[PDB]
Amino acid sequence: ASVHGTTYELLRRQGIDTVFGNPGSNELPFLKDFPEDFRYILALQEACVVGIADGYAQASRKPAFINLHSAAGTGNAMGALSNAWNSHSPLIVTAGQQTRAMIGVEALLTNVDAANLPRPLVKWSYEPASAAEVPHAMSRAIHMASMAPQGPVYLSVPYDDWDKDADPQSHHLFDRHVSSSVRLNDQDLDILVKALNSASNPAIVLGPDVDAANANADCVMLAERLKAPVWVAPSAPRCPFPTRHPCFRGLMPAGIAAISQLLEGHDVVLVIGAPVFRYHQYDPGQYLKPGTRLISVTCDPLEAARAPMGDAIVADIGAMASALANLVEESSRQLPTAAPEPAKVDQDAGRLHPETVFDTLNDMAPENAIYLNESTSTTAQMWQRLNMRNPGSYYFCAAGGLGFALPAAIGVQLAEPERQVIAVIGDGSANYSISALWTAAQYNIPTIFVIMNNGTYGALRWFAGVLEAENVPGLDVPGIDFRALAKGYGVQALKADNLEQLKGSLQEALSAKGPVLIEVSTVS
Amino acid sequence: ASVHGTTYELLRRQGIDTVFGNPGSNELPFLKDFPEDFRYILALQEACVVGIADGYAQASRKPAFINLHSAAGTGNAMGALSNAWNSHSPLIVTAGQQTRAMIGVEALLTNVDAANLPRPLVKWSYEPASAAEVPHAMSRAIHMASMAPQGPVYLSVPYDDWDKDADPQSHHLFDRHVSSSVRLNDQDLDILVKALNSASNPAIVLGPDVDAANANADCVMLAERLKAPVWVAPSAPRCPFPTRHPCFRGLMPAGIAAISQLLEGHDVVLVIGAPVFRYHQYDPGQYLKPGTRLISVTCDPLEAARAPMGDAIVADIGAMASALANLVEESSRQLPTAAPEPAKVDQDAGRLHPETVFDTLNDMAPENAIYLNESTSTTAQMWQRLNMRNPGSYYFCAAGGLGFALPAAIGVQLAEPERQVIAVIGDGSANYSISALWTAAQYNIPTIFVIMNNGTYGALRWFAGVLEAENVPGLDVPGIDFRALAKGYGVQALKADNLEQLKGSLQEALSAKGPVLIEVSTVS
Amino acid sequence: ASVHGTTYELLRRQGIDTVFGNPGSNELPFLKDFPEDFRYILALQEACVVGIADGYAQASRKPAFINLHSAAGTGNAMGALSNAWNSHSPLIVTAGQQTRAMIGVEALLTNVDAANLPRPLVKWSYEPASAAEVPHAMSRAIHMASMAPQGPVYLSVPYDDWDKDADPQSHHLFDRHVSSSVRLNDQDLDILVKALNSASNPAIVLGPDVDAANANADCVMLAERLKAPVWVAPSAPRCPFPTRHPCFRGLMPAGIAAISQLLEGHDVVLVIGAPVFRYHQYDPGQYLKPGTRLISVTCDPLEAARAPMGDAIVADIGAMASALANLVEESSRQLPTAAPEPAKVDQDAGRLHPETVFDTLNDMAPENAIYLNESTSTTAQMWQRLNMRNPGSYYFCAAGGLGFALPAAIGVQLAEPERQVIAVIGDGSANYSISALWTAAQYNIPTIFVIMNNGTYGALRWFAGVLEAENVPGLDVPGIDFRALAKGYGVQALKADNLEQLKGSLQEALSAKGPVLIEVSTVS
Numbered sequence A, B, C: 001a002s003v004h005g006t007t008y009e010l011l012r013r014q015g016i017d018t019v020f021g022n023p024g025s026n027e028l029p030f031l032k033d034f035p036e037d038f039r040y041i042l043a044l045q046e047a048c049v050v051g052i053a054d055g056y057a058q059a060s061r062k063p064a065f066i067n068l069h070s071a072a073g074t075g076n077a078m079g080a081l082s083n084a085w086n087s088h089s090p091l092i093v094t095a096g097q098q099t100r101a102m103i104g105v106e107a108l109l110t111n112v113d114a115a116n117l118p119r120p121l122v123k124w125s126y127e128p129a130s131a132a133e134v135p136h137a138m139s140r141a142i143h144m145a146s147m148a149p150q151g152p153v154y155l156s157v158p159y160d161d162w163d164k165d166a167d168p169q170s171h172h173l174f175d176r177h178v179s180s181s182v183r184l185n186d187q188d189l190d191i192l193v194k195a196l197n198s199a200s201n202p203a204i205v206l207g208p209d210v211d212a213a214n215a216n217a218d219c220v221m222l223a224e225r226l227k228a229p230v231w232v233a234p235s236a237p238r239c240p241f242p243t244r245h246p247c248f249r250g251l252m253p254a255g256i257a258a259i260s261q262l263l264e265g266h267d268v269v270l271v272i273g274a275p276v277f278r279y280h281q282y283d284p285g286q287y288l289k290p291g292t293r294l295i296s297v298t299c300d301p302l303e304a305a306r307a308p309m310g311d312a313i314v315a316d317i318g319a320m321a322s323a324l325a326n327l328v329e330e331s332s333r334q335l336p337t338a339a340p341e342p343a344k345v346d347q348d349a350g351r352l353h354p355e356t357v358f359d360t361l362n363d364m365a366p367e368n369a370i371y372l373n374e375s376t377s378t379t380a381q382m383w384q385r386l387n388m389r390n391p392g393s394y395y396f397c398a399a400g401g402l403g404f405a406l407p408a409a410i411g412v413q414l415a416e417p418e419r420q421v422i423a424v425i426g427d428g429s430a431n432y433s434i435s436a437l438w439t440a441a442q443y444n445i446p447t448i449f450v451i452m453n454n455g456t457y458g459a460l461r462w463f464a465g466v467l468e469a470e471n472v473p474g475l476d477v478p479g480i481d482f483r484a485l486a487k488g489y490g491v492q493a494l495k496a497d498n499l500e501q502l503k504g505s506l507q508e509a510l511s512a513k514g515p516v517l518i519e520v521s522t523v524s
Ligand SMILES: Cc1ncc(Cn2c(C)c(CCOP(=O)(O)OP(=O)(O)O)sc2=O)c(N)n1
Pocket: A079, A374, A375, A376, A377, A378, A400, A401, A402, A403, A425, A426, A427, A428, A429, A430, A432, A454, A456, A457, A458, A459, A460, B022, B023, B024, B025, B069, B072, B073, B076
């Protein structure tokens, strides 16, 4: 067999059936004779390719396979890889290299020092030393992406490798099963369970790896047994808990002092599936108040190492959440009471308050909708106003890198065809990966895109005011017609200048058979 | 003085007055109190920011300064940096970092291992160890970008650094003059001059560093004195010679065998300002035929080292071209005869042949127009059909990375306001950096964008046929309305479905007062 | 508190009480006011510093702390780090940096791009962005070294940092407990246990991470229950099993074909604590014969990913070995029969056969002796001839890098003062880290060094013969007087030219109160 045939057999045997790509000449010898049981999803720029694949991987809870063109294509995708690193997204990024005979002269399209290009944003990065090594290197890539802590990996392959003969002993790669589904040993787990049972006022903080593991329901049981309030760790990439469950307390503010103040009086704080903590704003103070002990369960040694406080356990989130939820005692304390609904912001017949938009989406969207957020000044309100009952219902750029949500919402929708995806994206954010719209049109992936148009980089204006920073350039983005951009890429387009039009547009979008973009005029 | 004030004084004293950027929160403490004598040029995605800056630097023949947001913004720009490396573009790429107090916990927006992120695509990459070092590190960045061989550099700065006190001894940085304007010592230069004078059938090959150095006129004199044909080195990023001068012989094919065949019978081949050689296609054979000696003058040790044949001299291209042009004898051989005009391709009243488009542009464009090429299947015809008399008249993505020409054409036009820029961009290529159009609209930078719409990745289809590669996915890009995209970003839009409409559209565009996009329907 | 006081409190609170070092000026502000409860162990070159620390860490089963001088000191230690990476040795390597005010000018002793220097041989490498971050970065270093898979880490600290004020909130670092003591979830563990119980002819292969985890006794129980032969994985850095236990079958040959042939007929092969596999010689063939299934338990995702065959489980070796040993059924098969003793090689009254040396050591050494091997041509015979009943009884350079055993034997002896350490080192190997002898003398660490003097790089001569490679230079090392070298560094020295003298010398050495070197004349 050839390296090409062996490699595609490895991919299929390891459950991969989709290639997210933007092709080039170094990749044509890989993409030729494309197997009939695989699907190719084209996107028009590599940030879009990787964003789509990322949303697909995150929602599918399985690795996604990518093929990019050499150094320039890889480079175009590196902002998307910054997010994928922070979300632990299991992405297998492949890129074609020049033919081995012309690497030394650095012919056009040579990826120089290729393995160093995507560092430090990948778990493993490699170029094989021979063609017959390619299947083995692909095996390594699959497993490195997929083992906890999951993350992106990179493999560069000289284009002449594919047609060469494979090692027949590569068959041993096909069915390898690699597990990291591990939990704390019984003796130490029993210590932890006793500390939880003995706590007088426990709190739980959950991060994105809970949702990645589909540990949400186990965390509900854990919270119910401990009678404990539940927060989402700051800068949240995913939603790990039902947002109208009585224990839910919302998104933590991303500040040192604010978090220690919130946790004051909680004697044991159990963090699961989050870094400790993804702070953002400068908010100096105490990491924890006297009287609070923190225990973190994390899938990532890097998280455990860098936590400034608390004990940690490095283990699989799914395995630990299940064990804890089934081992703790039922506390006799009263169950926490549900947070009240948010207030209705006064809304005239003009431009929409973001609060109005989120309330209307919550009113009209199906109960199993999936939301993406890249409306950076409105995150707090979004988290308060959307009832997200189910796992896999929320995504936000995990490194804060704009250009994620538009393509990722297409990947999520591809992963979950029965669940209506609604991406809420600011007018600034929408441009970074605007060309991703075309993939939704071409493959008829019926994502709804809600563009929050207030004409400015509103989160940055806000911050400039907290800095009392005057004369900052570049904060306004006037003059973008998002209906015209959607037309440009073949997506049905609507406008909402007031609440009546927003409801009419959403009704239309929800019943459409293809992707739809709604440009909403929001208060500046 | 603060680090902020000292740094902006350094920049101004070193001739920098423009910041190309997409802002973020780690950058607001740099961008605040933005000096009134500086200009900020906003673009909506970082590939666009860097492409614009690159075109500006290349055309202006001076460094361009960039400010990007942390890791995600830097990452979005890395495909643009792949091109900038290959063009030797002097780009000072800065990115904001988290406040030093929160780097260790890896707060959101921390650029982890920052200096490694843009490697291997930068000449120098650094994060200073203290705030007071920032001006000095900025000085290093300026000079590293600007010394031969020019290229991109990267500097990451924690946002809390700007307000700190600077070292008063940083004043010594302000007026430093750093020169690499060097040429071969007189004894060895005289040897080279004698070898050129003694050659019986010399040839000259010129690359992009000739145009970067504005050595074009000196190379004309050199060619005239030696009575030598002149070729452009393959995969050409720039045009180093008047294309209708009698010695001009065009773009070399990017193949090993093809180049040695072309040079057969030339006893001395003098290469100036190019790698030896930027081959592309697999075309195995002899690097040189018996009887040909090659001598390369290069500004880049990396080029000199990797050449598979020939002698080399590492020196400044401007200094060497001037010296050679003034020292060689006037040969008594006859001057080469000019190449004949290209043939007129038969054209009906339907979709446009690319040859027709280039002939019409050549007919109608001003004699000092500047062209950019990202119409990848039509490069050979473009090079044959445009009379480019002047330096700085052509740019093509130097690493082959799409997404260069659309933004770079805006930067070139900003650099050369009196010279009409015309970017000829395929429908596939146009999407990579489509949002760059907005910068042209907002700043009223009157670039003309000619979209060659044949609905496919035509260069890739072509190559798939040379491979006899069947079943390759992802090669078609139907369903893009470029007039709607231009409307989306505020740029005047025209369509050309036949030659009559192309001439009408070009007449309109050339007289417009702002940027214009023309969607041309080209033969598939 | 200062950064210095906070950092030493962190170290003590995390169990560190010893600094292995070679000092320099960038380190004096760290080493001043050296706490009275810490010990400093000086060695005369950094390969020796790190080797000593490595042996100490490996035998103590806890992290070892190192302080080296800037780039040059770090560099001198990088061959030692190659071994430490392969042995998963938990080493915290610190190096002093120039004062932050002079890093930018690259004053003498500046460690340029410091974190990249020890890559790729460290798990984590870092230089903090501020003085107050240093304790936190030290915390990260401790935990990164100590979490499975253990390994070396690197931290560079500007010398002016130590005297600065620490963050009072660094107290939260002091008592952090970080666990990776995890095992496969119960459902999947039960599947594995059933596969082991159902096997008709299981085999066990053990690697060094078994001995690191002190899982040896659990592996004995596992083997006894399964009635399974036990092999040591090839290129063994440690001894994971009693070598005269009836199930023991010795060191596997480090070849692909040889291993599959050895495992032929074994239906399930359980590998614990080893890479799959650390082959050495080129011995192409089948990774496994038909009928053999392989299951690997590894503490290292990198091992799991790169195995060319088999399933894998990534978990703590101690936790998995205990669980398996207590869960499998007692098989009714007969216990394997012990291997017979090795043959006595004929020995005249002249130069010693290595087999004679190992038999005599086995005869005379205490039953709880610890051996180190850097006698590269005699490894197979050593493994056959030493009865090593206890854990922690064998060390061999895990990357094959010479210069390990001499210093490591001093560290092992420091770690295990009641267990006589005997390092068996070839005459070639002895030179790499010869100066380590001085540390044994100065601290009166009573290691016995047995130099196997045959005047040649015997393993290389052997290989040159398997290659039929003629005219290979540099394979002989005549003219070294090891008794004089030992005198030079203050270590008692003996010679053994025949067996009578070897026994007399060993008797003397075993009763000595300090370190002793015995130069043995071995057959060439
Ligand atoms: C790739 C990238 N570039 C720049 C930024 C900086 N940035 C920018 C530019 C923001 C404004 C986003 O504006 P928007 O219109 O999408 O939303 P709001 O008006 O609600 O803030 S939020 C922010 O962090 C970023 N995070 N990622």
